[PDB]
Amino acid sequence: MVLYFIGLGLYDERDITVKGLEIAKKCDYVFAEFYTSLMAGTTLGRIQKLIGKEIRVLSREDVELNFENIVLPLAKENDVAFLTPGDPLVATTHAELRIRAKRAGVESYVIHAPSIYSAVGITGLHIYKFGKSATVAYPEGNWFPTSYYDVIKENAERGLHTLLFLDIKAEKAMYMTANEAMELLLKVEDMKKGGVFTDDTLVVVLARAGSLNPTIRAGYVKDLIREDFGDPPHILIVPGKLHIVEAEYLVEIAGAPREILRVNV
Amino acid sequence: MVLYFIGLGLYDERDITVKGLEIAKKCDYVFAEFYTSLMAGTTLGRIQKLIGKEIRVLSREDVELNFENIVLPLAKENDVAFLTPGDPLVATTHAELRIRAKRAGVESYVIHAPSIYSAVGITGLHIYKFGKSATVAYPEGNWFPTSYYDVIKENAERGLHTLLFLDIKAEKAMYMTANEAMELLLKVEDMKKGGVFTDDTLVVVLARAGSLNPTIRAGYVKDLIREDFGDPPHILIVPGKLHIVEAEYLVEIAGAPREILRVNV
Ligand SMILES: Nc1ncnc2c1ncn2[C@@H]1O[C@H](CSCC[C@H](N)C(=O)O)[C@@H](O)[C@H]1O
């Protein structure tokens, strides 16, 4: 009669909370989805070994089209867990799954875990200064989406930071790198000429948040566009004007050039 | 010979990540602060029991003025952990403590935990639609903070949601309720008269996120301003223009007036 939405956290199998682990261990059935994102620092086998339960993976179609006939039926007479990378319901489509549960007469509870949304606090950028977020999508065929560029423009003009999620082909385990994202933004800039993203733009790259050894780098596009930030996943941030404390953290912790203390504050 | 900043999560001792627990258990010294937020579902005793170590609680003064005299000295010859509610670097100034660690020759690591900043996803509002955040602070003497009002205005004009952290005076055991925040906002409205926050404004309240049964309520200020949302901590959200699915969730899960389903596109 109960369905638990449980977050797996940021990077590996230990990023789930103690609460989520203990609840998952007591569930009769455990499902999981790895299409909204992946857990790059672990494997399905390691997660399964930690929880001590067989884990049934669901595709985007299984969930979006058949959640009510795959998961809910079992939840009607058993304790069922639905694991998701990060924090449950951060992904935009997951919230409605609670409505499906309600419709089916199934109780649902959410067990939170760290999300990249809050983990960006490790960049030293003040969380309250982040504005609207966006996702950088790979262009394809005759389609060249650029809404993420407009998001940066609108945030930056108001002195806010912009968190940019990078494209991912979960099923193929293919990640867009911060380097590719910078190249794309420069390309969009050459097209719109809004003066939003250039070689002189200060950016921050956060790779493998959640790991004990994440890569945190800050600097100008001209210098970082060909830098190796390590293995995925990568997150790109275009900060707005910086509070001196933010700049000092970027210099001392993220290796940013001293120049940001006079140019970006 | 290391310093760990470890988050404890949203509500109780089990909101810590498995990673954070296993590391904290092996540290030589464990310090913590409980003034940046309120963990309403646990006690120092229960946390100490889970980690199996004595926890030295520090005051805001101990940290801000003497972190390098109380904590860092030990981290030079031992493994030390500094625990905090939620995520250690979200809506705190703890990021700067990493600079103090460096300058003192101490390597530091960050272990994330569930944060209210991303937990608001449970309200059904799209996380990417949240704009700049703000804090509603208690007026003191002749000083009456009002900056949070302008934040709501700025976000709303862009169709973005506004997350409002509520004030906390840990030493006085005072935790601002969503009710007190709404009252303060109505007073600022009468002053600036910008039509930003009125009795007809739709708001969302999330209380005790992290618990299994948090209070999630949506409705007009005139109806919610005197409603009992249970014990603290509370967070207040002022949504911007709603997507249909957001409205459906607010109605189905947060008990909002069904009239909001009729979005004015
Ligand atoms: N479990 C919870 N439920 C509702 N609001 C919460 C909360 N935890 C924190 N808050 C909100 O955030 C304020 C403290 S701000 C510090 C936040 C913390 N670092 C984190 O990551 O969550 C509180 O006064 C309250 O308004």
UniProtKB/Swiss-Prot annotation, chains A, B:
S-adenosyl-L-methionine binds at L10, D87, V90, S115, I116, L166, A209, H234. InterPro entries: 4pyrrol_Mease (IPR000878), 4pyrrol_Methylase_sf (IPR035996), 4pyrrole_Mease_sub1 (IPR014777), 4pyrrole_Mease_sub2 (IPR014776), Dphthn_synthase (IPR004551). Coiled coil: none annotated. It is an enzyme of class 2 (transferase). The keyword Methyltransferase applies. It catalyses: 2-[(3S)-amino-3-carboxypropyl]-L-histidyl-[translation elongation factor 2] + 3 S-adenosyl-L-methionine = diphthine-[translation elongation factor 2] + 3 S-adenosyl-L-homocysteine + 3 H(+). GO terms for biological process: methylation; protein histidyl modification to diphthamide. Its EC number is 2.1.1.98. It holds the Pfam family TP_methylase. Homodimer. PANTHER family: DIPHTHINE METHYL ESTER SYNTHASE, DIPHTHINE SYNTHASE. Belongs to the diphthine synthase family. This is Diphthine synthase.
